[PDB]
Amino acid sequence: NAMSVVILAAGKGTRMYSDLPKVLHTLAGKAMVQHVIDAANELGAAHVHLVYGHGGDLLKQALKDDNLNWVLQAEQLGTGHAMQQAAPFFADDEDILMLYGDVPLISVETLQRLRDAKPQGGIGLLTVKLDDPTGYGRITRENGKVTGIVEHKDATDEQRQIQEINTGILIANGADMKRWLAKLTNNNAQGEYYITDIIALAYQEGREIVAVHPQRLSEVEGVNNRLQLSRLERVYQSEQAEKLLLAGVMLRDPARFDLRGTLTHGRDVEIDTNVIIEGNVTLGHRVKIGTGCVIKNSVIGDDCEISPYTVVEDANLAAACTIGPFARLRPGAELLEGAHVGNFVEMKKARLGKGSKAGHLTYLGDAEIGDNVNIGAGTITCNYDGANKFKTIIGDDVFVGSDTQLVAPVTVGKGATIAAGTTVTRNVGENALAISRVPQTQKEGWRRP
Amino acid sequence: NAMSVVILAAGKGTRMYSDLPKVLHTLAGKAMVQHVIDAANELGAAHVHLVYGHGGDLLKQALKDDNLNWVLQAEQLGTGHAMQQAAPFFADDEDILMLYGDVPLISVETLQRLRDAKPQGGIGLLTVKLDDPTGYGRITRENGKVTGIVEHKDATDEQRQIQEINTGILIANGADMKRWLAKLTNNNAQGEYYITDIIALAYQEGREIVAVHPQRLSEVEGVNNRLQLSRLERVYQSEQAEKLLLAGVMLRDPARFDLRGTLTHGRDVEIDTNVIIEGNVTLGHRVKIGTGCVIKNSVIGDDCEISPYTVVEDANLAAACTIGPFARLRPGAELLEGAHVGNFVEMKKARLGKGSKAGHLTYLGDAEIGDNVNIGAGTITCNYDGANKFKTIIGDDVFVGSDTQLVAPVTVGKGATIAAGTTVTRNVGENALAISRVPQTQKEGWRRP
Amino acid sequence: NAMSVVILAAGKGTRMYSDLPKVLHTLAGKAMVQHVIDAANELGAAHVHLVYGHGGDLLKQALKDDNLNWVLQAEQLGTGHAMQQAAPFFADDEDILMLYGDVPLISVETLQRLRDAKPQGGIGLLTVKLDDPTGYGRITRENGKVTGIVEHKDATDEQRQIQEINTGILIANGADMKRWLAKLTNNNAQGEYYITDIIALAYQEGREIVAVHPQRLSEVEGVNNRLQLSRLERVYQSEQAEKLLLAGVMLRDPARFDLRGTLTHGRDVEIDTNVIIEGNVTLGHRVKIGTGCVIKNSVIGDDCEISPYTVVEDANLAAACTIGPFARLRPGAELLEGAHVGNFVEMKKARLGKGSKAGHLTYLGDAEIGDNVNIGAGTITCNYDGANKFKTIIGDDVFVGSDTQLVAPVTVGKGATIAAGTTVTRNVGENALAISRVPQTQKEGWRRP
């Protein structure tokens, strides 16, 4: 069935004390509004109308969904007024689902439920019963049938007794939406245009309004300040962790795990406490991740073991690799089968071959290292002359002495050996020994200052 | 109005199993007793009388508040006995507020509330209703008026039914305090001098006692063991995090944030999980702090970005600086505008100029580095001859090759260049190339052991 | 009294989605089944019969308890059927305690309680009252006496009202167990052999069954998926932390502490957030551990201070040592009194003498360093020629310049000095200066690319 979504976000987020539009504040790696848009498309929305008031520049820059139709609302004269701005773009024969830009946890399952309950020619309303319904629109019923909504400011004490409140989410036919929206007046407490008035307008037109409730309260919770955002952050993370656990992923402590993106995985993956996954991460079978690790946009093959406190970004590790602790892999880092990177080791645009080892205090940038190569501690690749960056190539079976510096561009033949403390400025022949050492001398009875 | 405070802390903290006085155990960066003293001064206390029994040496060494009058209590013959020791120092025309040295969360707001309720010539008592009032003094009332307090050991079963218990906090006039304190006898269960007896003494003298309740239970919670201390630690941290969130500071996870000191901040500051702030920290606008960072007594300018797992102490970062991950800044570290420090890099008493970069495996100590300077990986400043430490100076536009060691004292002119693997023992001219390299040689068909 | 235990674990752990037997999944550092076995032996079990179905190869490899008698159960025809397999190995005059391999938190105290309640010739049954007893065996009583157990599938609606359910744990006499087990039929809902039928069989034989309840629900909780495992992980950790706090160990945040092994300690030990202890760890008096530290199978002497993010394994630190932050100690690391290891420093099979300092960017492997020695930053020990590893020896009062590489095997006499950037390939005399430096030269007006 034809369906379109409208997201209102033209309200001012004052209690955020931010120079960034409220709906742009991230939650689990993405803008709150982006969460709403995803649910919209995920539900099958044809067009997603976004109503904004200011910061539209940062908005258009942060959001780039193909089916995103921008609707301006200069003045915030009420949710009804806002809906009237987008009304013109409602297809007569399509359904219109209204959503809030600051309610990120709304689920597709519940939205799909609201769609089904929506009577033909009627309205699908999402409501919830709170212990304290203070400050929210009150749902009124006649013989069990929803006949309208009364705002807190307009409701009488007796009416404020009603605990079934309006979440704001509702769905109706485009043509119907337009007919009602046109009849909205601002003769009420707030003195604004209530989108909630359409509920009565539909009831008196003989249309019926059905109410549906969400799975969890957190689903329809709105964010006005940072403390509320942090709260929903925990809910999201807890649900994610929980899904991963039930999905076969072992988390040492779910309360101490954060997923800010997407995580593909194999069987028996084990993740210790305080680990953060960002962007798209792929984990093979039996992957072990120590505590405090940070993995972003990376691929990790089977049986890999990531030791504690290792930062990885845009890297690709083949099977059976072991890196860390205290390893830092930067964009372009590649490790072939059984490769090993020790502590205090950094890799940027570098490839370590099969079984190759970069054990300690080393920096590999812009280099291609063959298989069975051994990089001693202190080895560094000089890939920057202050203006340009150069490549370092090391063939197979190479042994690089510690504290060796390779000045790029340079190539070290296969089976070659580089003495410790060597400065390589020229290519090294295969099966040859490169060296640049001053014979050790000594001075008897040398007293220090 | 004239007011003085008395803090009792002469009791033995046996269940702490510590060689340090109980009240000296830290909470959020400071001694529990120090928390009490702060609330005292913060309330406007003229004099703060501290009653101690032992460990007075460590106490006087840990506490150094100008208005701290030390009152000894050799024997712990009861809270009343303790108060009698300080009684002599009570000004007749001043008010006296009594507090416990092991109840760190008492708030000024509640103490200020207790002050106002205190009737002229009467007493201001702080009380709370517990689900289980077992083990605490029971508040007795006649026609709604507090007429006294009955200790648990002295109370009858029927009286132990009363749930309104004494927290210990009370305020009265100095002169009044002395008159009552003088009449204290130890004819009771414990066989000690109950400070709580003054409540009845005031009632029978025609004085009236008013009761005031605290905002939260945690406010008047006492610490006898380490488990209770940890509990209050969480309360304190949770309240702090919560204030920061509502104040505009974004915390990825409030449950995973610790503030042990003071934190000044700008707008849109973002802090990831497991971050610890110690001492006085100043954060400019839009400052980003990655997970697991530790910042102590430091200043961080606008738009700075602190990558994961970076330790900073007594450092000063100008605007737009980027340090970490895995960076360690020690006392005296200064970074000018746009400075960058990579992973596995340490700075002690060193200044990195504008736009200067210390990317990897580097140690900078006792040095002054100009602007637009580039420090290659492995570079080290030798600032210690085994007895003295020497300074290293590097002018602007300098390029330092990797694995370069500068033996201080040494100066590198502006625009100068130092070849990789160089040992600088002498000054380098401006726009000159410093070098100490052995030409690379080679030996064909070299077989390794 | 004679007692033996039987652990059933032949059930399939499907919802674990693992290639490892469910009972083998670790909890607090050890396999879930291992937890059960420990409680068995800890209670004084003579023989521990383990009933398994598959993965027996990984089981026998993971478990190696002397008194472990393996009992196979090819088909899982019910708990009763399983017990019949081990029945043959029950001593007529000994007691038999039955336990589940997936209920790791069962405590010895509660098991010892169940033993005492067990009537002579009767049965000791452990039961619990749940809010929702759905899916568990229902305990039936006649005049307050347990007369049997009815499984959920067999129980009627009315009977499912009973909230006292069977935990599975029970104890009876071997001879009695055999007599009843022989009479088990599978004429019930599940169509299996219920071990629970012995309860009725005993009742009708005139024997009496007594019921005992556990201290906590978590005690008898079973694990079928990873989410439930994580939950019990938190319970275990919380209880452990709590014991340590009450035992005098200060934990900055108990929720952020993990103990996976055994921890011996002294007085006033202080542990910051996110610290992990693995294997057997010994902590002396006044030991301080910063946040994010990982300590495994190590010994730490009095007054040691472990800075943030330091990984230690099979190391031994004498008194008053200070290591970190960002230090990595590998097997064989030893530090003598007052030794210091800075940031980005790694030690493997190395000994640092008294007062010796390895401050930065250093790697010490296979070395013996005397007292009062100073290792400058960048120093590295070359202990691997690509096939063999060699030892490095440095006598007392030695000063090693920065970025020095010692090629093993090599020995540096006492009081000797090594110039910065030196490559030591030969032994150095005592009180002598070792060097291999190229005089610094310069080239005027050198322009970079």
Ligand SMILES: CCNC(=O)CCNC(=O)[C@H](O)C(C)(C)COP(=O)(O)OP(=O)(O)OC[C@H]1O[C@@H](n2cnc3c(N)ncnc32)[C@H](O)[C@@H]1OP(=O)(O)O
């Ligand atoms: C764990 C990390 N370890 C490392 O990084 C250490 C790497 N190893 C080295 O740097 C070693 O000193 C080397 C591989 C260069 C030598 O191996 P080793 O110490 O077992 O053998 P030697 O000391 O007897 O090697 C001497 C050879 O190297 C050459 N050599 C040694 N010092 C110098 C020098 N200053 N200039 C030119 N060649 C030299 C000689 O030509 C000689 O060749 P030959 O065998 O035909 O006489």
Ligand SMILES: CCNC(=O)CCNC(=O)[C@H](O)C(C)(C)COP(=O)(O)OP(=O)(O)OC[C@H]1O[C@@H](n2cnc3c(N)ncnc32)[C@H](O)[C@@H]1OP(=O)(O)O
């Ligand atoms: C990413 C981090 N990278 C680094 O740290 C690498 C820093 N770069 C270096 O150390 C480079 O080897 C240098 C800057 C010294 C040379 O630049 P580059 O390799 O592009 O040029 P060249 O190899 O042709 O430089 C040769 C010059 O340096 C000098 N040079 C090279 N090796 C030696 C030596 N052993 N002794 C004395 N001078 C030497 C020569 O006097 C010569 O001068 P000229 O241009 O008048 O003939």
Ligand SMILES: CCNC(=O)CCNC(=O)[C@H](O)C(C)(C)COP(=O)(O)OP(=O)(O)OC[C@H]1O[C@@H](n2cnc3c(N)ncnc32)[C@H](O)[C@@H]1OP(=O)(O)O
């Ligand atoms: C904080 C970490 N710091 C470090 O690692 C720095 C360690 N210090 C060094 O490497 C120093 O350069 C040294 C210990 C070698 C020299 O000490 P300092 O700079 O105060 O004294 P000098 O520069 O005047 O030392 C010169 C002596 O060393 C020797 N020396 C200096 N350069 C060389 C060289 N290229 N070849 C041989 N010997 C040399 C000379 O034989 C001379 O001996 P003398 O005193 O009888 O004339």
Ligand SMILES: CC(=O)N[C@H]1[C@@H](OP(=O)(O)OP(=O)(O)OC[C@H]2O[C@@H](n3ccc(=O)[nH]c3=O)[C@H](O)[C@@H]2O)O[C@H](CO)[C@@H](O)[C@@H]1O
């Ligand atoms: C009049 C109305 O609809 N009342 C409902 C609305 O309250 P109420 O209107 O008071 O709520 P808000 O003002 O927060 O508006 C909700 C959303 O609409 C946006 N917005 C608001 C005004 C405007 O002119 N433009 C605009 O885009 C806000 O940015 C926010 O995303 O939500 C409550 C639940 O949260 C319901 O219980 C109320 O019955």
Ligand SMILES: CC(=O)N[C@H]1[C@@H](OP(=O)(O)OP(=O)(O)OC[C@H]2O[C@@H](n3ccc(=O)[nH]c3=O)[C@H](O)[C@@H]2O)O[C@H](CO)[C@@H](O)[C@@H]1O
């Ligand atoms: C007699 C008395 O006052 N009773 C009150 C006291 O109990 P109670 O007297 O039993 O409590 P404590 O012994 O812990 O004393 C409270 C505080 O007084 C200090 N101290 C105690 C005795 C002494 O001789 N010197 C001294 O300095 C302790 O170190 C502690 O800081 O506090 C309870 C709340 O916590 C109240 O409900 C009780 O009504």
Ligand SMILES: CC(=O)N[C@H]1[C@@H](OP(=O)(O)OP(=O)(O)OC[C@H]2O[C@@H](n3ccc(=O)[nH]c3=O)[C@H](O)[C@@H]2O)O[C@H](CO)[C@@H](O)[C@@H]1O
């Ligand atoms: C028939 C029976 O005993 N019923 C009890 C059993 O339920 P129930 O039999 O349904 O429970 P499970 O199937 O999980 O069996 C419990 C334990 O026995 C093992 N196992 C099971 C069958 C088998 O043939 N071999 C085997 O070794 C499982 O691996 C598990 O460790 O435990 C519940 C509590 O958890 C009790 O409330 C039930 O009254």
Ligand SMILES: CC(=O)N[C@H]1[C@@H](OP(=O)(O)O)O[C@H](CO)[C@@H](O)[C@@H]1O
């Ligand atoms: C400074 C150095 O070269 N250390 C070597 C050396 O370190 P160990 O920590 O001892 O394993 O042996 C490794 C192979 O076992 C090699 O990969 C590494 O580079």
Ligand SMILES: CC(=O)N[C@H]1[C@@H](OP(=O)(O)O)O[C@H](CO)[C@@H](O)[C@@H]1O
């Ligand atoms: C070993 C080395 O000198 N690396 C250089 C080099 O590292 P990259 O990680 O490739 O960016 O370029 C940097 C400037 O882009 C410079 O600051 C740094 O010192």
Ligand SMILES: CC(=O)N[C@H]1[C@@H](OP(=O)(O)O)O[C@H](CO)[C@@H](O)[C@@H]1O
């Ligand atoms: C590169 C270097 O050698 N730094 C020295 C030097 O570091 P500082 O951080 O300045 O303390 O003095 C230390 C003794 O105070 C010595 O142990 C260390 O090795």
Ligand SMILES: [Co+2]
């Ligand atoms: Co070097």
